[PDB]
């Protein structure tokens, strides 16, 4: 067993560490670590240490971490750089584990848990923990068990014990259907009072103290709630036992006009699964509730139940407990699929950081680079403060709103990381500047070649080509590592246990590598990264902005020569690292007529791209490279999509309403020829969570009908949809939104100045519902359905909004399902955005429409 750390904390002058020893047992140790920092010295000083600029450095070994930290402030007062890794935990980590870390996840306690708190009033604020915790389910990855803590008697009810037998039975049989996979893994524990429950849980927590602590929202609700409850009841020093080092800090987050507080538990790494998912999932969702996600990921959600959750414990304690358990299990089932915790461990051990830092691109890269330079006696720059100045970013072409029959799209691979390597952008690489011509001049090889000596970016920056930059070297290394591991995955498929084993469990390294790669430019633009430099960040994006436009010229010119046309605009759209070309003239040179079926032309274009364009492109970028005199040429484009209408149909190809707003009928993607064509829709309301369900549906149909079938097909559907609108379920045709800053406009239960339309709706609901505690209340920052109300309604206003995902209290319903203004609803959510589609694609959604309402 090669040792490896579990958690590291610096608690003034001493480092507290939890680690797995050479025998796989968990041990903990206190170390009075002595760090070393560095200062520039004269050349007379003989040293093995140099900064990234080659300047000699003296190594200063401190008595304790306090001394070190003192010297830094004292060094800041003087005016001289204080070189070295200032986050000692990392340094200490790098010293105690200088070698590749191999971890046995098996020996790492990973706890996943959830809490239940019956509350008669509103949501039980974790900062105050006013109500009893009547249920806790805590799964421990080591024992592979679900430990359940049931509160039998509470100010809110005295209930019977929970039943496994029943829990396992079908819903038909009155059971909870707790999966059989876990049924024999549940360990049940009923308590007579909360104090017993809490104190028993706390001792359990000491025996099976978590290393990694996750669950769904455990960081904003469960952990603070447990901490505060135990604290309010017993002493504060009892709550602290929740920390293996008995130290905890109250951290206050104030993001997005809010202000919440979490509890830092020294000696534990919290990875709230809802955050891991938001990060490493890369799939923006209209909701992040455990149910929605669970459904999306596993095809089933949280246990279902009747009545208000706050009434569930009395009414159905049996389900209540089972619901608690199923919630813990749902999370595990997602991780059993996405392996995010596992992905977090790989990363943390690859960079040698606290696993929690997997949430910070900066901390991660700083650590990766820090160890890379240590290994070669180099000293990292001191972190510097930097005014936050916004620099120009990605380039985006204004498209001519229109229909586009045939379209091929191309992508640049890892543009930004490529740009760093190709130009060699890094702090200790800046070699100077050059008079800057206007960007377009560069995009057209008209401006004077910036240099004969240095690598250049259009923003006037010049870099050395001889030496190797720290940043570029570091990504390249990762790029290589990615190709290494995904090189094993290639042959790791030729007793398939000695072929598949790591073939997939190993490949996931390919993943993290990719994650570092795509997060480097992010760090570089962050003023808190010790390698940030405004000039460089700007050099990276400006070069990219030149890239896309220079290649647009090249692709334009080529197709024009090839097609015997001149001045014709082929590149119809460009977005940061990709272009979309119109292939009409290329389809014509052959004549749509000469094609067997659709797959025929989809094949023609594929070849044409791979055979005639790709090389003109690589030719073009190579020229650009000689122009900027770059270190090397990493500017590689790929044919992405091939789109067009089904051969023989009257469907337009696709269309563009504006920037980031378009739709295509794609038949091929990077090579994969789909069986049926797929709609690629970007920015249209069909892709918006605020668009009423039924409507995003009919809008998607409308788009499809437009692309694949003709205009006639579209009009038929439209007519039908109006004709049938009033017959749709109201939950389906009601728009949705988020209720933020309700009271900010709540003036006596009425709308103040600038009151947003939906917030106003909320208030109308509020007033028609004031006096009832038997009516689902409109919480803050939540989500609300919104419906327009016909003129002269009893709610006294144009609209109303109630809590989403739910029906509407029979108090106001019927009256709502009577005054809702279908007309206004249809127009606002369906007809107008469609009209935006049609006007752009040059189509009508209603026969005969004076072609003139398109002028002025």
Partner DNA sequence: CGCTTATGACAGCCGCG
Partner DNA sequence: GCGGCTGTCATAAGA
- The residues binding DNA (CB under 7 A) are 219, 251, 253, 255, 262, 272, 275, 284, 286, 356-357, 359-363, 390, 392-396, 398, 416, 518-519, 521-522, 525-526, 657-661, 681-683, 687-690, 736-741, 744, 753-760, 783, 828, 832-833, 836
**Based on CB atoms, which residue is closest to DNA, 534 or 647?**
534
Shortest CA distance to 513 belongs to which of 538, 484, 536, 555? 484
Residue written as tokens 């010295």? 41
What's the alpha-carbon Rg for the chain, to the nearest Å?
Answer: 31
CB of 683 to DNA, least distance (A): 5
Element (H, E) at 372: helix 361-374
Q: How far, in Å, CA of 603 to CA of 812, rounded? A: 59
Shortest CA distance to 149 belongs to which of 111, 206, 199? 199
The breaks in the chain (C to N more than 2.5 Å) occur after 494
**Based on CB atoms, which residue is closest to DNA, 572 or 681?**
681
Q: Do residues 420 and 475 lie in contact, with contact meaning Cβ atoms separated by under 8 Å?
A: yes
Give me the count of residues in the chain.
856
**Based on CB atoms, which residue is closest to DNA, 522 or 805?**
522
CB of 260 to DNA, least distance (A): 9
**Based on CB atoms, which residue is closest to DNA, 185 or 659?**
659
Q: Do residues 235 and 250 lie in contact, with contact meaning Cβ atoms separated by under 8 Å?
A: no
CB of 214 to DNA, least distance (A): 11
Long-range pairs, 724-729, Cβ under 8 A, ≥24: 725/822, 725/826, 725/830, 726/822, 728/694, 729/694
Shortest CA distance to 463 belongs to which of 504, 431, 511, 433? 431
Q: How far, in Å, CA of 336 to CA of 298, rounded? A: 10
**Based on CB atoms, which residue is closest to DNA, 285 or 772?**
285
**Based on CB atoms, which residue is closest to DNA, 432 or 796?**
796
DSSP state of 609: I
Q: Do residues 384 and 394 lie in contact, with contact meaning Cβ atoms separated by under 8 Å?
A: no
DSSP state of 610: I
Other CB atoms closer than 10 Å to residue 458's CB: what's the count? Answer: 25
CB of 320 to DNA, least distance (A): 29
CB of 595 to DNA, least distance (A): 30
**Based on CB atoms, which residue is closest to DNA, 612 or 688?**
688
CB of 634 to DNA, least distance (A): 16
Q: How far, in Å, CA of 737 to CA of 741, rounded? A: 13
**Based on CB atoms, which residue is closest to DNA, 513 or 783?**
783
Other CB atoms closer than 10 Å to residue 12's CB: what's the count? Answer: 9
CB of 183 to DNA, least distance (A): 33
**Based on CB atoms, which residue is closest to DNA, 557 or 782?**
782
Q: Do residues 541 and 555 lie in contact, with contact meaning Cβ atoms separated by under 8 Å?
A: no
CB of 803 to DNA, least distance (A): 14
- Residue 483 phi/psi, 5-degree rounding, is -70, -25
Task: Give the chain's end-to-end CA distance (angstroms, integer).
Answer: 78
Q: What is the 3-state secondary structure (H, E, C) of 227-284?
A: HHHHHHHCCHHHHHHHCCCCCEEEEEECCCCCCEEEEEECCCEECCHHHHHHHHCCCC
CB of 200 to DNA, least distance (A): 28
Q: How far, in Å, CA of 809 to CA of 605, rounded? A: 57
**Based on CB atoms, which residue is closest to DNA, 633 or 828?**
828
**Based on CB atoms, which residue is closest to DNA, 94 or 696?**
696
**Based on CB atoms, which residue is closest to DNA, 147 or 573?**
573
**Based on CB atoms, which residue is closest to DNA, 32 or 827?**
827
CB of 76 to DNA, least distance (A): 24
CB of 622 to DNA, least distance (A): 23
Other CB atoms closer than 10 Å to residue 134's CB: what's the count? Answer: 28
CB of 346 to DNA, least distance (A): 17
CB of 256 to DNA, least distance (A): 7
Tokens representing 665? 């009928």
List 187's β-bridge partners, or say none.
Answer: 147
CB of 534 to DNA, least distance (A): 12
**Based on CB atoms, which residue is closest to DNA, 213 or 321?**
213
């Amino acid at each position: 067993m090669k040792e490896f750390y579990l958690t590291v904390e610096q608690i003034g002058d001493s480092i507290f560490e939890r680690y797995i020893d050479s025998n796989g047992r968990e041990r903990t140790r206190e170390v009075e670590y002595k760090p070393s920092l560095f200062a520039h010295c004269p050349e007379s000083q003989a040293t093995k240490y140099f900064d990234i600029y080659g300047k000699p450095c003296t190594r200063k070994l401190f008595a304790n971490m306090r001394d070190a930290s003192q010297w830094i402030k004292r060094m800041e007062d003087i005016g001289l750089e204080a070189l070295g890794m200032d986050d000692f935990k990392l340094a200490y980590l790098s010293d105690t584990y200088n070698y590749e870390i191999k971890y046995d996840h098996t020996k790492i306690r990973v706890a996943n848990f959830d809490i239940e708190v019956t509350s008669p009033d509103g949501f039980p604020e974790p900062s105050q923990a006013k109500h009893p915790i009547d249920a806790i389910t805590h799964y421990d990855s080591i024992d592979d068990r679900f430990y359940v803590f049931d509160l039998l008697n509470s100010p809110y009810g005295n209930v019977e014990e929970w039943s496994i037998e029943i829990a396992a039975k079908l819903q038909e049989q009155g059971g909870d259907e707790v999966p059989s996979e876990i049924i024999d893994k549940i360990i049940y524990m009923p308590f007579d009072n909360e104090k017993e429950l809490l104190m028993e849980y706390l001792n359990f927590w000491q025996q099976k103290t978590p290393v990694i602590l996750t669950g769904w929202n455990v960081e904003s609700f469960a952990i603070p709630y447990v901490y505060n409850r135990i604290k309010n009841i017993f002493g504060e020093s009892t709550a602290k036992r929740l920390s293996p080092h008995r130290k905890t800090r109250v951290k206050v987050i104030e993001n997005m006009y809010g202000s919440r507080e979490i509890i830092t538990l020294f000696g534990i790494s919290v990875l709230d699964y809802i955050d891991l998912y938001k990060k490493f999932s890369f799939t923006n969702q209209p909701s992040y509730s455990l149910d929605y996600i669970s459904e999306f990921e596993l095809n089933v959600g949280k246990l279902k139940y009747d009545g208000p959750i706050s009434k569930l414990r009395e009414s159905n304690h049996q389900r209540y407990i089972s619901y608690n358990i199923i919630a813990v299990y749902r999370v595990l089932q997602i991780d059993a699929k996405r392996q995010f915790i596992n992905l977090s461990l790989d990363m943390g051990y690859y960079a040698k950081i606290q696993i929690q830092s997997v949430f910070s691109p900066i901390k991660t890269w700083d650590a990766i680079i820090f160890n890379s330079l240590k290994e070669q006696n180099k000293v990292i720059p001191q972190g510097r403060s930097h005014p936050v100045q916004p620099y120009p970013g990605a380039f985006v072409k204004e498209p001519i709103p229109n229909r586009y029959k045939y379209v091929m799209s191309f992508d640049l691979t890892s543009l930004y990381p490529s740009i760093i390597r190709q130009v060699n952008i890094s702090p200790e690489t800046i070699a100077g500047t050059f008079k800057v011509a206007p960007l377009h001049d560069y995009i057209n090889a008209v401006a004077e070649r910036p240099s004969d000596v240095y690598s250049c970016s259009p923003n006037g920056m010049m870099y050395y080509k001889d030496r190797d930059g720290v940043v570029p070297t570091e990504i390249t290394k990762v790029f290589n590592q990615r190709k290494e591991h995904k090189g094993y995955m290639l042959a790791a498929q030729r007793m398939l246990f000695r072929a598949q084993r790591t073939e997939v469990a190993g490949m996931t390294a390919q993943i993290n590598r990719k994650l570092l790669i795509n997060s480097l430019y992010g760090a570089l633009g962050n003023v808190w990264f010790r390698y940030y430099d405004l000039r460089n960040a700007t050099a990276i994006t400006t070069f990219g902005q030149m890239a896309l436009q220079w290649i647009e010229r090249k692709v334009n010119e080529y197709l024009n020569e090839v097609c015997g046309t001149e001045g014709e605009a082929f590149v119809l759209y460009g977005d940061t690292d990709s272009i979309y070309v119109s292939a009409d003239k290329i389809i014509d040179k052959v004549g749509e007529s000469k094609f067997r079926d659709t797959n025929h032309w989809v094949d023609f274009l594929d070849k044409f791209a791979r055979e005639r364009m790709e090389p003109a492109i690589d030719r073009g970028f190579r020229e650009m490279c000689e122009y900027m005199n770059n270190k090397q040429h990493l500017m590689f484009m790929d044919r992405e999509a091939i789109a067009g209408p089904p051969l023989g149909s009257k469907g337009i190809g696709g269309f563009w309403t504006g920037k980031k707003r378009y739709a295509l009928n794609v038949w091929d993607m990077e090579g994969t020829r789909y069986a049926e064509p797929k709609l690629k829709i970007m920015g249209l309301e069909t892709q918006k969570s605020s668009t009423p369900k039924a409507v995003q549906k009919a809008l998607k149909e409308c788009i499809r009908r437009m692309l694949q079938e003709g205009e006639e097909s579209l009009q038929e559907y439209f007519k039908e949809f109006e004709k049938e609108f009033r017959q749709l379920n109201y939950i389906s045709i009601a728009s949705v939104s988020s209720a933020n800053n309700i009271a900010k406009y709540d003036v006596g239960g009425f709308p103040g100045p600038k009151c947003p339309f939906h917030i106003r709706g909320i208030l109308t609901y509020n007033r028609a519902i004031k006096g009832n505690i038997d009516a689902p209340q409109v919480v803050e920052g939540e989500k609300v359905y919104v419906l327009p109300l016909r003129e002269g309604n009893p709610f006294g206003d144009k609209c109303i909004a109630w809590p989403s995902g739910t029906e509407i209290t029979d108090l106001i319903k019927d009256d709502v399902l009577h005054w809702m203004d279908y007309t206004v609803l249809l127009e606002k959510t369906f007809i107008k955005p469609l009209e935006g589609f049609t006007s752009a694609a040059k189509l009508d959604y209603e026969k005969k429409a004076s072609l003139f309402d398109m002028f002025d």
